[PDB]
């Protein structure tokens, strides 16, 4: 339960980065080009937390897994969506680069 938990509060966590990404936009548009090419910066930066912090927990179902399997199984299918979550984050973040 706590994992699950926990994992809930990552997922949140996600939501609430890109909520992130999307306030540090707004600022004049003279300035929002400069502000989009700062936000990739500092997006490329926040990727190298994001990947071991999900990590993390992909790692800590895996053990549940064998120490349980029966039941973690639907957890991973839930984690599968934090997963695809980042993906998208992932390739968003590589448009913008190029």
Known sequence: ???????????????????????????????GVQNLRKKHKRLEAELA???????????TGKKLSDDNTIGKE?????????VDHWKELKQLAAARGQ
Not at 3 to 30: A, C, N, P, T
Not at 49 to 59: N, R, T, W
Not at 74 to 82: G, P, T, V
């Open 1 to 31: 339960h706590q994992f699950f938990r926990d994992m809930d509060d990552e997922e949140s966590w996600i939501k609430e980065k890109k909520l992130l990404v999307s306030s540090e936009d707004y600022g004049r548009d003279l300035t």
């Open 74 to 82: 639907e957890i991973q299918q839930r984690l599968a969506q934090f």
């Open 49 to 59: 937390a994001h990947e071991p912090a999900i990590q993390g927990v992909l790692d």
